[PDB]
Design a protein around this ligand. Structure first.
Ligand code: NI
Length: 341
C-alpha cells in the first residue's frame, strides 16, 4: 500500500509511486527522475498519465517503452495547469531530467516536493523566492552531521588532474570510469575533454546518453571502443579481476588502466580530504574512489531548509526505522529554534 509521504493532499496526484498498481483516486502519477527506486513498476503497459520532465520522458519512451500519449512532459520554470491545479517543475541539481515539484492547492496551501536533490544557493533566487511554502517533502539521504563531502567542481578538478597527469606520463594508459545509473556524467565528460577524446561505452549506455539533451553529444561519445581512451564500464565490473578481464579484451593497446569510482559518502570522508586521496593497486591497474555526490550534504540541506522556513517537513528517505525517524525530527527542531521560524 502506497505510503502517505508519496501522496499529495487535496489532489488526485501521487509522486514516485509506480510500484503499488492502481492507487485509488490517483488521476496523475508524477515521476521526479529516472532512477529505478523511484520508477520501479513503469512499463509499456501503463495507461495513466505520467507527468515528468522532457528528459525523463525520453527515457520513459526509449528505455522502458511507454507510449507517447501517456507521457506528459512539461517545461521547467513555467507555470502549468494540470487537472485544474497550478504546478511548476524546478531543476533538482540531481541527475539529468531530475526535478522538484511545486503544487499550488485550491485551498491556498503550497507544497514543495524535492524529489532527490542537491540543495544549492541558486535555488534561493528561483520561483521559490516569490512565495510561502507550507509543506516540504524532503530528500533526507544525508541528514546527519557526519555527512560532509566536497563541491562537485572540486572533485572535477582532482579528476581532470589525476587523468591528464597519467596520460601525459604514460601515453599507453587507459582511463576507465564506473557507472550503473544516470548521473555524474560530468566525471567522464570532463576527463575526455582534457584528453582530446570521445568517451567509449556499450550500445545500451550510448542509447541512455542519447536521450539526455546534452548539447553537442554526438561529438562527445562513441560506441567504437578501440578509437577512444576514456571507457565506461559497469560499476560491478570496476575491480581487479574484472579490470584484468577488460584489459585483455583491448588487444595489447594499453599497458595501464587508471579507473575512477564516483561514489557517494563512505566512512573515509570522516578522516581524509579530496586533495589527499589514494587508490587500491594490484599490479598495473589503479582504482580511485572519489566522492562525487548528487544529494545534499548536511550543511547544504540545513541552509536550504532554514531559508525556506517551511511550516511542516515530511521526510522521504530513511523513513523505514523509528530510530532514523526520531533522529531526523531532532535535527528539524534544532534548525527551527536556531532560525526563529
Ligand atoms: Ni536518485
Amino acid at each position: 500500500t502506497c505510503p502517505f509521504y508519496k501522496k499529495i493532499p487535496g489532489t488526485g496526484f501521487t509522486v514516485d509511486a509506480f510500484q503499488y498498481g492502481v492507487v485509488e483516486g490517483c488521476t496523475a502519477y508524477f515521476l521526479t527522475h529516472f532512477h529505478s527506486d523511484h520508477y520501479a513498476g513503469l512499463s509499456k503497459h501503463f495507461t495513466f498519465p505520467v507527468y515528468c520532465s522532457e528528459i525523463t520522458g525520453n527515457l520513459l519512451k526509449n528505455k522502458l517503452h511507454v507510449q507517447e500519449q501517456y507521457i506528459h512532459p512539461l517545461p521547467l520554470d513555467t507555470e502549468c495547469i494540470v487537472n485544474g491545479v497550478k504546478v511548476v517543475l524546478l531543476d533538482a541539481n540531481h541527475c539529468p531530467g531530475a526535478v522538484m515539484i511545486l503544487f499550488y492547492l485550491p485551498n491556498g496551501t503550497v507544497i514543495l516536493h524535492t524529489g532527490d536533490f542537491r540543495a544549492d544557493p541558486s535555488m534561493e533566487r528561483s520561483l521559490l523566492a516569490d512565495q510561502k511554502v507550507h509543506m516540504l517533502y524532503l530528500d533526507t539521504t544525508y541528514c546527519s552531521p557526519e555527512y560532509t563531502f566536497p563541491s562537485q567542481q572540486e572533485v572535477i578538478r582532482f579528476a581532470i588532474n589525476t587523468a591528464f597527469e597519467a596520460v601525459t606520463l604514460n601515453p599507453h594508459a587507459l582511463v576507465v570510469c564506473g557507472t550503473y545509473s544516470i548521473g555524474k556524467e560530468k566525471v567522464f565528460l570532463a576527463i575526455a575533454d582534457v584528453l582530446g577524446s570521445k568517451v567509449g561505452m556499450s550500445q545500451e549506455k550510448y542509447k541512455t546518453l542519447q536521450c539526455l539533451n546534452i548539447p553537442e553529444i554526438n561529438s562527445l561519445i562513441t560506441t567504437d571502443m578501440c578509437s577512444s581512451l576514456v571507457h565506461l564500464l559497469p560499476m560491478m565490473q570496476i575491480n581487479f579481476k574484472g579490470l584484468q578481464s577488460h584489459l585483455k579484451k583491448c588487444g595489447g593497446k594499453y599497458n595501464q588502466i587508471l579507473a575512477f569510482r564516483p561514489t557517494g559518502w563512505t566512512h573515509s570522508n570522516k578522516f581524509t580530504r579530496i586533495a589527499d586521496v589514494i587508490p587500491q593497486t594490484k599490479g598495473n591497474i589503479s582504482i580511485y574512489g572519489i566522492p562525487y555526490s548528487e544529494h545534499s550534504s548536511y550543511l547544504e540541506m540545513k541552509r536550504f531548509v532554514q531559508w525556506l522556513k517551511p511550516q511542516k517537513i515530511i521526510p522521504t528517505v530513511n523513513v523505514g526505522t523509528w530510530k532514523s525517524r526520531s533522529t531526523m525530527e531532532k535535527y528539524f527542531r534544532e534548525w527551527k529554534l536556531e532560525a526563529g521560524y
